[PDB]
Symmetry: C2
Subunit: 100 residues, 2 copies
């Protein structure tokens, strides 16, 4: 299993209700896209890095490196980006195999 | 349970062997600091955001918001920072309660 980590900042004009809908809709993609196994999101509470200003984290689990592309080309993921592109100001994306 | 997420970039002079030791030593803190419940780390494989250049992720689980401070003041965590401060170029720290 691999992890797909999204770190983001919303645009200032986006409301709390819009953010709640954004995450509810993203979380539901697990039910639509086979490769997408689970998702959690969170709002940062510490605000340590104020200049950068990322506020939210989304972590998705995929069964493998090879199945990420299945998600990337899935109409539901493409659709999510099409609906909500204007909501985010910036993001960082990471993909990795957890180790300990 | 809450999550404590560290996103970092090592200095260019730090070797792969040094990184391996860094993470091995950090992961072992779970055995020393009661509040620290688990840890995983990963190396980003995508390199989507090259200007920012963060390369590694560490995710720690704490039992609660209130016990994070127990970790923060623990001599073993302070010690880890004292030993390895010079290894990292920059980092981002987030703390959040996972939601879905």
């Amino acid at each position: 299993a691999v992890k797909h980590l999204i770190v983001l900042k919303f645009k200032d004009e986006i409301t709390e209700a819009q953010k709640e809908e954004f995450f509810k809709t993203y979380v539901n993609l697990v039910n639509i896209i086979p490769a997408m196994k689970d998702v959690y999101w969170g709002k940062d509470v510490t605000q340590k890095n104020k200049e950068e200003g990322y506020t939210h984290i989304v972590e998705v689990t995929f069964e493998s490196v090879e199945t990420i592309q299945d998600y990337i080309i899935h109409p539901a993921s493409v659709g999510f980006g099409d609906v909500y592109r204007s909501f985010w100001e910036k993001l960082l994306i990471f993909d990795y195999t957890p180790r300990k």
